[PDB]
Every structure is written in C-alpha cells, then in structure tokens.
Amino acid sequence: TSILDIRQGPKEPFRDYVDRFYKTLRAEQASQEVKNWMTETLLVQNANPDCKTILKALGPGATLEEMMTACQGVGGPGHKARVLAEAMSQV
Amino acid sequence: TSILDIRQGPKEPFRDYVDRFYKTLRAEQASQEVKNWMTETLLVQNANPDCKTILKALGPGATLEEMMTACQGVGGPGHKARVLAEAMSQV
Amino acid sequence: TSILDIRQGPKEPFRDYVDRFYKTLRAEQASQEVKNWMTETLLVQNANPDCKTILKALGPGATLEEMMTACQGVGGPGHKARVLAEAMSQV
Amino acid sequence: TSILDIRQGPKEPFRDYVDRFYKTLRAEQASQEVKNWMTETLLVQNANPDCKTILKALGPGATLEEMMTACQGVGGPGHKARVLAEAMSQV
Amino acid sequence: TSILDIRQGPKEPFRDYVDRFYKTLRAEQASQEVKNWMTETLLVQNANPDCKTILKALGPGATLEEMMTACQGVGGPGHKARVLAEAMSQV
Amino acid sequence: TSILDIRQGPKEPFRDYVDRFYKTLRAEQASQEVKNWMTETLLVQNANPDCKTILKALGPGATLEEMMTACQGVGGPGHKARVLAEAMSQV
C-alpha cells in the first residue's frame, strides 16, 4: 500500500476516503513536512469528480471540517436530485 | 476515536447516526454537562444535508423523539420522490 | 434494548420491522396486557412515513396479515413508480 | 419458524422467496397433502404485489417453471423501466 | 443441487451466473456430450430477460467470450439509461 | 484462474477491476513481455461498455493514471445524470 494509490471510489463517501487517506499517510515512511504537502496535494487530487467539483468551488484556504461538511451531501437525495435536474437542463 | 469526528453518512439513516453518536459520547472523557452541550451542538451540526434541513425546519426545543420521527422519511420512496419533483421544479 | 427504541428504518421492509418489534417485545419486562397495548400503539406509531400512510388509509380493525400484505409493496418497483408519478403530479 | 410467516420481500427475487418457502415447508410438521395445498395457496398468496400481478396474469394451471421464468424479470432494468413508463402514463 | 435449477437472478451479472452454471455443471453426474448439450440449451434458456434479449440479438454461433462481452453492459449506467429512454419512447 | 477470464463487472469500479487484473496477472505463468502485452490488450478489452467508451475517447498513449482518473466518475451522480440526459436526448 502507498499513499499515491489512495483514490476515492465513485460511490464512496468523502469521510471514508479521507479516513483511508490519513490511515495510509500515517504509515508511509516520510518526513512530516512531506506528509503535510502530501495531504494538501494528494487529498484533493485523488477525489472523485463530484467531490473534486465541490472542493474546486470552495477554493483554497479551506480546512478539513469545511471540506467534509461540504461533501457529505454527495449521494444524498438532495444532491442526486439537483445534479440530475442540472444535467437535464444542460441537455 | 473522538466525538467530534462522528458525522452522518450521506446515505446513513438518522437512527443509526444518533446511535453511533450516543455510543461514542458515553465513552468521551468529559463531565456530564459538557456531554449534554456536546449533544445539543454536535448532534445537529454533524448531520447530513437532508436531515439538517428537516431539523432546521423544526427549530429549537424538539426532543429526540420528535427529530427522529421527523427524519425517518429520508431515503424512503415518498421522500426521494418529493425531493426529485421539487428539484425538477426548481430548475 | 427497549421496545420504545424500535423504529422502522426508511429503507427497511415492513416484515423485518415487525420481526424486530415482536422479538424485542417478547423480552421487555411487562405484563401481557401492557404488551398488547404496547403492540397496538407502538407498532403503528414507530413506522416510517410511507407505511404509516398506507396503514392510516386502512384505518382501525386491521390484523397483522392485512397490514403486512398491505405494506409489502413499499419499495417494490410498482410502489416507487406510483409514488413518483403522484409526486410529479403534485408539483 | 412457520410456513404462514414466509412472505416475499418487496425487493426480494422470486427464486429466493420460493427457496425459503420450500426450505421452511420441508420443516413444518404436517401431512404431505397439507403441504401441497399449502404450496398452492400460500406460495401465491404471500408474494409481493408485482409478482402477484404477473402470476395473476398467468392464471391457474401454471407450474413452478412457468411462474419463476415469468417473474425473473421483476427488478431488472427492463421491468423497472416499463413499470415506470406505464405509471407515468396512468397519471 | 441440479443443473436445471440454475436460473440467472434479475439483478445478477452474467459472468456470475455463467460461473454458477459451469460450477454446477461440473458436479452433475452425466456424460460429457450431455453436458455440452446442457450448456447450449440451459445456459441461454435460464438467463434473465435482458441478457436473453441481447443474446437473442446475437443469434447462434456465438462463443462465451462474445456473449459475456455482449452482456457486461447490463446494469451499467449506459444500459439502464438506454433501456429507460426506449421505455419512455414506447409509452 | 486465468487472466483471460478477468472481466470488469457492470457495476464494478475501474480501480477494483484493474486491481484484480494485476493481482491475477502477477500469478499467470508467462514471460514479462507477454505480461506487458497482456496488460495493453486485455486491460482495455475486458472493461465494461462505459469505461471502454471513455478510454476509447482517450485514444492511445495514455497511462494507467490518466485512465483511472478518467473513469472514477463512472457511477457517480454526475456521470449517471449526464448519461441519462444524453440518452433521453438521443431518443
């Protein structure tokens, strides 16, 4: 197992994904600074398209609390509904 | 494990979430008053968007019975349907 | 575990819910009469919105056979479809 | 466990349900003739609304092969789609 | 257990179904030729309506590779979508 | 078990499929060059229709990172929505 191989599943909730990411990051043999930079880069890069969209909408400077609270809607009825309606409107 | 990390999954039923929340709260090392305040704040803050919407509509002064009885519709056929129709109407 | 904490899940089939309800009710320390009254009140009170709608439509005087046979449609394709269409008609 | 309590789940496939029905029926203490009559009556009576609709369309005189082969469409994409479209047409 | 009772589930993927079919066929006491004929007849006869539709569209002379590669779309988003749209067009 | 029998499930995420593909590929008795060629041909050939569509759109010269990052949208709300809308537009 490597930190680079941690990718969020398409139907995986964000909290689970970040949990696996941090579990694995606590194991990789690397300096703390490298672990922080890893956090900032990988954590956002390896999310699925929906969560990556929301986080891209948040911009920079957001904490984990803000991100996770922003993403726990994905897959919920309201999210699926809004996304579907927006998709039908686009096409 | 910490009480602050208990967040309701997007597809998780409310009863399960409150079950984990109270199971964990009985373990966190803190005074009884701090545990009650934790209940009031976290329990509502850490729910997913749908349940948070319904509970915000209930307002304050509601008991666990009133909240849970208010939220067990989420994910049910009627709930998903109503949410979908309202979403199509919005866009 | 207490009989008052037995609540039907949003996606839980009715037969399962009544199975848990009676399994738990056979354990609660209470007189037989109190257990019957418990049955009549809780069993209907703690169901989810869809089943509560159907049972409310049945009215009083219905047996468990009539109720369960009335509710095993919930979640089935026909049920979800009919409910969805009615929801679209409402909005 | 009793044969009268075997009911098909709303999302349960037919083959599984008949499997439970025959497994439990093989245990009930009763004469063989009573077990056959049980088969004919309960097996059709305790199915969910969709399968009961299809089997009601088949009528009497059908064997298990004809029924099961008639019902394995339930829940499949084609079934859910057709049912949904017919429901939209009704309303 | 008998080869005649192997039926594809409504939501079962084709690869799994053929896996059970061949696993069981390796157990049934019968000559190799009878097992081949069993393959040709049962394997296609006992599939669910969607897979039976696609395979019927393929016609005869197709190998297992062609069939399985033809059916792995069933249940996928694209399949369910196409089937749903065709269903709405039909009604 | 043989590498030729590794096929992506209809609802299986791509990362899982490639994980099984490489897990099995590390076991098949063959020279390394044959294993690379196996990778290039089978890995893309045995995917389901959606992933095969996206990867076919990518063309040649793409690495595993580009493919996997391209496919983790499959099954996500946005993907299913876009596919559904495009399907309704086609018909």
Residue numbers in the entry:
A (entry chain K), B (entry chain J), C (entry chain I), D (entry chain H), E (entry chain G), F (entry chain L): 148 to 238
Paper text:
Assembly and maturation of HIV-1 and other retroviruses is driven by the viral structural polyprotein, Gag, which consists of a series of independently folding domains, called MA (matrix), CA (capsid), and NC (nucleocapsid). The Gag shell has hexagonal paracrystalline lattice symmetry, wherein the central CA region makes two layers of interactions through its two domains (NTD and CTD, for N-terminal and C-terminal domain). A second putative switch spans the junction between CA and the first spacer peptide (SP1). In summary, our studies reveal the molecular details of a bipartite HIV-1 CA-SP1 switch with critical functions in both virus particle assembly and proteolytic maturation.
To learn how the CA-SP1 junction functions as a molecular switch during HIV-1 assembly and maturation, we determined the structure of its immature, assembled form by X-ray crystallography at a resolution of 3.27 Å. The CTD-SP1 plate crystals were made up of stacked sheets of flat hexagonal lattices, with each sheet consisting of CTD-SP1 hexamers connected by CTD dimer linkages. Our structure therefore represents a flattened version of the immature HIV-1 Gag lattice. In our crystal structure, each subunit contains the main CTD fold (amino acids 281–351 in the HIV-1 Gag numbering scheme) and the CA-SP1 switch region (residues 352–370). The switch region immediately follows the main CTD fold, and consists of two parts: a type II β-turn (residues 352–355) and an α-helix that spans the CA-SP1 junction (residues 356–370). The CTD-SP1 hexamer looks like a goblet, with the main CTD fold forming the cup and the CA-SP1 junction forming the stem. Underneath the cup, the junction helices form a 6-helix bundle as predicted. Therefore, for PR to gain access to its substrate, the 6-helix bundle must unfold. Our structure revealed a second structural component of the CA-SP1 switch, which consists of five amino acid residues that connect the main fold of the CTD and the junction helix (352GVGGP356). This motif makes a right-handed type II β-turn that buries the Val353 sidechain within a shallow sub-pocket at the bottom of the CTD, which is made of the MHR and 9/10 loops.
